Amino acid sequence: ASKRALVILAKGAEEMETVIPVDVMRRAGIKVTVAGLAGKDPVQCSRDVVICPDASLEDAKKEGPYDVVVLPGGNLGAQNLSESAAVKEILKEQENRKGLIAAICAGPTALLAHEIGFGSKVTTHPLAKDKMMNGGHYTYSENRVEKDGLILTSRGPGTSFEFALAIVEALNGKEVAAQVKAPLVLKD
Amino acid sequence: ASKRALVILAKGAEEMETVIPVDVMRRAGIKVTVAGLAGKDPVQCSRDVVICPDASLEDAKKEGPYDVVVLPGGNLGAQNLSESAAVKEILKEQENRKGLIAAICAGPTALLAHEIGFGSKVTTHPLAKDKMMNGGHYTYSENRVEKDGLILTSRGPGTSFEFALAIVEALNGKEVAAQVKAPLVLKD
């Protein structure tokens, strides 16, 4: 009866945007797998924080399905996500079974690369707007967190807590999100 | 001419409170060393995020002095900090040369354990208040970030960004802090 989350971790990912959702989702009782795009080996994030993934994406792919697939940002991280055929397959499968897809900052640009969720309202980091909108395939929002259908997007490292709590609220409900939020000492 | 920061990383540390200051301080151009209390080996944080430190605390101690020593929280992490003789020595030396000491959430309780900064105004996580105040050696504040003399404290994972930016402002000044803050997409 446990919800499951896949977090895809590539070289150059924004480490804050990786750790905050993982930590919060685990506080909410979600089983999170931090899966390394390139293997089980340690991943050097954008600000040189080095994180050990729980599994390779190859192995984590076989233990599906997940209730949410999480794509962190960081410019080089999103580019590695956008170029990976394994991500495309995971995302396409998740879209077909109507599971949640969550991406933050530059992460939403992987969606465009993989032709995921066309027609949806999305937000990105402001500096990633032009890239996300090449072709007019999405409608842009400046909300800090945006949720359209099964696509949940958010804007930057500073929105990471709100992004993560929105994932909790979607998987586990508003009361669990409120319960996990209180000990964090957020402002609003 | 580069400012230097030491972040002391122990088993059971709050990984969000570790990664957010490291990342922000590095955005501000500070040279940060993430030093593992027990050695160079990977550290399992409170929510099972596993981080590789840059160096052992033993080696990092020899490359001093630092303009700021940073103590993350997490209950078991702070307890490991409070029990470590190496931390006591580092903190006592930092206090003597009038360098900044920064601690968040449960982290300030290591200060009490090590008889650091008595008489100062401090804040902690609400759940750590009773422990910090055993003996009446500090004055308690409920400000989200509190700075009294060379002691900078903060309350919880949700105050991590404000804590980190306060470190930046103290080391590098208000304009650098404002410059690093803008791309993060913080609310206030």
Give the other-Cβ count within 10 Å of B48's Cβ. 13
C-beta atoms of A144 and B52 within 8 A: no
Cα separation, B125 vs B103, whole angstroms = 11
Nearest to B23 among A49, A184, A188 (CB): A49
In angstroms, what separates the C-alpha of B158 from chain A's closest C-alpha? Answer: 4
Residues B108 and B91: beta-carbon distance below 8 Å: no
C-beta atoms of A16 and B15 within 8 A: no
Nearest to B185 among A50, A52, A158 (CB): A158
A114 is catalytic: no
Expressed in Å, this structure's resolution amounts to 1.8
Cα separation, B134 vs A34, whole angstroms = 40
* C-alpha closest to that of B83 among B120, B37, B119: B37
B105 is catalytic: yes
In angstroms, what separates the C-alpha of A68 from chain B's closest C-alpha? Answer: 18
CA B68 to chain centre: 8
B127 to chain A, any CB pair closer than 8 A? The answer is yes
Residues A38 and A10: beta-carbon distance below 8 Å: yes
Residue A56's beta-bridge partner residues? Answer: A36
C-beta atoms of A157 and B23 within 8 A: yes
B152 — phi, psi (to 5°)?
-120, 120
Q: Does domain B1-187 have CATH number 3.40.50.880?
A: yes
Task: Pick from A9, A14, A16, A50 the residue to mutate for testing the B interface (most B CBs within 10 Å).
Answer: A16
Backbone conformation region of residue A20, classed left if phi is above 0, alpha if psi is from -120 to 50, else beta: alpha
A75 to chain B, any CB pair closer than 8 A? The answer is no
Query: Element (H or E) spanning A6, and its range?
Result: strand A4-9
Q: Which SS3 state, helix, strand or coil, does residue B103 take?
A: strand
Helix ranges, chain A (H): 15-27, 57-62, 75-83, 85-96, 109-113, 129-132, 160-172, 174-181
Give the other-Cβ count within 10 Å of B185's Cβ. 17
- Using alpha carbons only, give the angle A119, A120, A122 rounded to the nearest 5 degrees: 135
Delimit the domains of chain A by residue range: 1-187
Cα separation, A71 vs A44, whole angstroms = 16
